[PDB]
Design a binder for these strands. Structure first.
Lengths: 82, 129, 208, 126, 226, 65
RNA sequence: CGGGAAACCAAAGUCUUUGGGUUCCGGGGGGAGUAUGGUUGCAAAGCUGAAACUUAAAGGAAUUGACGGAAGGGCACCACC
């Protein structure tokens, strides 16, 4: 949303679904993401450091949010042979 | 039966993206479908596609992201006169700025921007944004 | 694997699971659950993928850690088989509770006396606990859930396939979650075994 | 019937009982005195009507827990009762009897176990 | 002014962050898609210097045992002039309450508007990025970007809403029973709100995004009560 | 660059500037689009005969003229 | 999902983001399927089908009472027994 002199105008840049790459817009409160903990490898020891995904109202109402998370969590770990 | 084949491919796509789908199998495909899928591709509105070869007429798999609000087909394929292109894009595009009208001209299936630059014109195929 | 090793399967657990008869799975699959399914037993019944049941449970556990204030993860059950179960989970991990008649207007509706703003809901039957699952979807709160093969997938992100027909399957899975979360971002340390007998989770019931 | 206690009364009874159980009694005459000590009630007829219904409750409570009333002592009693556990019941006795396939369930689960086979016949719907 | 400010106290964690000066703009809420249940939140973050115009009064009624009933319905719109607007309809026993409640309802509903350039983007957005339409029970309003000086070409009621929204220039076409005002304003309200939903190519790329002020401020938003 | 747009655009601008109605950055078409009535109204006699003392009123001005 | 004014509708969906093929009928309500000419019919009648004039609502859907010699309903010697 540039303006004349490369300036950034209007007022915000919305987050985009983690499954459908579609704008979460802005009053659709039937939607939320999901912070997964990073682990200090080895195992346990929750260390931050979120691995995070945002899922749209749409996907969730269509009886996905879950799987989407899995394509999301495995593709970037953890989660394997799902 | 079938009059056109493009219109089916486009619709199939639109319903895929509307569902929340990331792939489609269109059938049966054609040189014109390829060319249109291709113009879409150059611009980002779809990912990569693949023509599978049944010993028949073809089947295409399109992998789609989700930048696509709509890809429509115009029927019939009206003739356009260089200052009917200006009239078309206004009729059916979201802002002057973006979205393409894609037509077929003597010098190739092209988005209207490429049309304006070449300086040729022809008959209207469809659109997207 | 993933996060790197020890965290994998452990026969010890695959033993508690098979024992508690989790994997047994519903005769009616349901479409969104098809992935969980390992194989269909003759004489109709499905074998859930414990390996899959396992890993997701761990994925669940991890999402429960990462919430900073442990109190505000709500463990929920109106089902009897899961009532002592969740009460126990809330005792160990921070985790506030919601058993029995969920009470409508608990997430929407400030005014109410059971008004809660969780950052994570964990539900045990998405069909029995449909109210909480619906209310949660009125206010941007993620959901872990107990799902057998034929449970509603609407508004639930993360399933842990179970059996939820019942017995200790509901007991063990809540147990293992609390066991898992205490390990992660907790302080069990040494994704070594339990001083707590898993029976402690498990339904009570009646008297003559 | 004609005397159906109204909420203003019934509430007070649930109320007192919740905060008064070990104080209250079996007998109308005494609670009535107690309501003077533990509550401020405006007319004597009301206070009587209250004492009376709450006694009808105490008479009932002292014969079986009543649908919506909780007191510290009753909680303690349920707590102790809710301990029980024997020789224990499964056993299940030497050897599980399986339905097979459930036998093939272990057989193809990499799992030893006790055994028995009796699983045949199909198998009508309805 | 001096009348003795009230004593808002918040039900909601989102609210605590706002009063604490922890949340400062609605954008945070909008990006997070936090629901807003306490009207004061809207009041503190914006609304200050946001003006509410009452659109309509029309009365209705329904039948009692011993005959009739009748009551007042008020349609209220709220918005600064830039980028924020809300719409609220209420029916109540008394006009004042109907208006007073309507305003509250409008504020809760406040919505983002994405305002854009007819084409050559100099000196900040005059119109709309694309063309967005909204429908409410057979009335449908279509907004179209227009060149500068075009202004709001709409019916008076719609012009008023679009005005508060902060749109300078826009073309409109309306179909359906435009007469039924509650419907027409509602559709237009949906139309404007749809601008945020449009994905343009500018938007095509993604983002660590945010952690949510709810999470960072979490302690802050569990005070010392219960 | 379109001979029609160039030849007439520049002319419209130059015409609009001779009268002071318009200014240079304006003095392109992108700016006339973002213009208004006062800008014309400001150039009439009447208001000038005020604007340099020689009237002291938009009034006086019109009867003077 | 989405449609529709709703009742409803997996088609009445993919319709303002309005464009797959083709065919038919309607443009407030009454006058009227009437007059009149043509046509078909043994006959009874059928098809095509106006106007003058008349009139500001005709109509649809949902919502709610009132009311019922509709169904389960009750309650009272201002009701019966």
């Amino acid at each position: 949303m540039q303006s004349n002199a490369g300036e950034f105008v209007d007022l915000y840049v919305p987050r985009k679904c983690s499954a459908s790459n579609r704008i979460i817009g802005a009053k659709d409160h039937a939607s939320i993401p999901m912070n997964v903990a990073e682990v200090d490898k080895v195992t346990g020891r929750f260390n931050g450091q979120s691995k995070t995904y945002a899922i749209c109202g749409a996907i969730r109402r269509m009886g996905e949010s879950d799987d989407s998370i899995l394509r999301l969590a495995k593709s970037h770990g953890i989660v394997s042979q799902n | 039966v079938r009059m056109n084949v493009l219109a089916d491919a486009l619709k199939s796509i639109n319903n895929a993206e509307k569902r929340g789908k990331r792939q489609v199998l269109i059938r049966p495909c054609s040189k014109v479908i390829v060319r249109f899928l291709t113009v879409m591709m150059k611009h980002g509105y779809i990912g990569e596609f693949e023509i599978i070869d049944d010993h028949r007429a073809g089947k295409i798999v399109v992998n789609l992201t989700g930048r696509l609000n709509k890809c429509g087909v115009i029927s019939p394929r009206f003739d356009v006169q260089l200052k009917d292109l200006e009239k078309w894009q206004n009729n059916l595009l979201p802002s002057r700025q973006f979205g393409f009208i894609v037509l077929t001209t003597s010098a190739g299936i092209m988005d209207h921007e490429e049309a304006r630059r070449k300086h040729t014109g022809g008959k209207i195929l469809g659109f997207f944004f | 694997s993933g996060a790197l090793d020890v965290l994998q399967m452990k026969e010890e657990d695959v033993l508690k699971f098979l024992a508690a008869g989790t994997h047994l799975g519903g005769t009616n699959l349901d479409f969104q659950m098809e992935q969980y399914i390992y194989k269909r037993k003759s004489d109709g019944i499905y074998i859930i993928n414990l390996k899959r049941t396992w890993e997701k449970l761990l994925l669940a556990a991890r999402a429960i850690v990462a919430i900073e204030n442990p109190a505000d993860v709500s463990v929920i059950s109106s089902r009897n088989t899961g009532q002592r179960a969740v009460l126990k989970f809330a005792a160990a991990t921070g985790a506030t509770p919601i058993a029995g008649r969920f009470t409508p207007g608990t997430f929407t509706n400030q005014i109410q006396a059971a008004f809660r703003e969780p950052r994570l809901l964990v539900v045990t039957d998405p069909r029995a606990d449909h109210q909480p699952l619906t209310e949660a979807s009125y206010v941007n709160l993620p959901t872990i859930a107990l799902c057998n093969t034929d449970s509603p997938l609407r508004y639930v992100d993360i399933a842990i396939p179970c059996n939820n027909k019942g017995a200790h399957s509901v007991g063990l899975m809540w147990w293992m979650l609390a066991r898992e979360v205490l390990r992660m971002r907790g302080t069990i340390s040494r994704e070594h075994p339990w001083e707590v007998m898993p029976d402690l989770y498990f339904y009570r019931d009646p008297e003559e | 019937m004609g005397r159906v206690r109204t909420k203003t009364v019934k509430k007070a009874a649930r109320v007192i009982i919740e905060k008064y159980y070990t104080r209250l009694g079996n007998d109308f005459h005494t609670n009535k005195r107690v309501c003077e000590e533990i509550a401020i009630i405006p007319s004597k007829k009301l206070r009587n009507k209250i004492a009376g219904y709450v006694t009808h409750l105490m008479k009932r409570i002292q014969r079986g827990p009543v649908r919506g009333i909780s007191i510290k002592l009753q909680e303690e009693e349920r707590e102790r009762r809710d301990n029980y556990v024997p020789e224990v019941s499964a056993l299940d006795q030497e050897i599980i009897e399986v339905d097979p396939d459930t036998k093939e369930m272990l057989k193809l689960l990499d799992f030893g176990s006790l055994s028995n086979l009796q699983v045949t016949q199909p198998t009508v719907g309805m | 002014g001096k009348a003795g400010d009230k004593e808002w106290l918040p039900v909601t964690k989102l609210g605590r962050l706002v009063k604490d000066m922890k949340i400062k703009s609605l954008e945070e809420i909008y990006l997070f898609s936090l629901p807003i249940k306490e009207s004061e939140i809207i009041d503190f973050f914006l609304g200050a210097a946001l003006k509410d115009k009452v659109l309509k009064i029309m009365p209705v009624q329904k039948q009692t045992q011993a005959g009739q009933r009748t009551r007042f319905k008020a349609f209220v719109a709220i918005g600064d002039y830039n980028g924020h607007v809300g719409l609220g309809m209420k029916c109540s026993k008394e006009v004042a309450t109907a208006i007073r409640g309507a305003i509250i309802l409008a504020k809760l509903s406040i919505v983002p508007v994405r305002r854009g350039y007819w084409g050559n983007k100099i000196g900040k957005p005059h119109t709309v990025r694309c063309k967005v339409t909204g429908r409410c029970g057979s009335v449908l309003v279509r907004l179209i970007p227009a060149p500068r000086g075009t202004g709001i070409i709409s019916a008076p009621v719609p012009k008023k809403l679009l005005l508060m929204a902060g749109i300078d220039d826009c073309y409109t076409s309306a179909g359906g029973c435009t007469a039924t005002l509650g419907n027409f304003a509602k559709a237009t309200f949906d139309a404007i709100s749809k601008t945020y939903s449009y994905l343009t190519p500018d938007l095509w790329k993604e983002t660590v995004f945010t952690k949510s002020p709810y999470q960072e401020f979490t302690d802050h938003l569990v005070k010392t009560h219960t | 660059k379109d001979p029609r747009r160039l030849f007439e655009g520049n002319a419209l601008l130059r015409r609009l500037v001779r009268i002071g109605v318009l200014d240079e950055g304006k003095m392109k078409l992108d700016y006339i689009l973002g213009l208004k009535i006062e800008d014309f109204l400001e150039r009439r006699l009447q208001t000038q005969v005020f604007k340099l003392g020689l009237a002291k009123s938009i009034h006086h001005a019109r009867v003077l003229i």
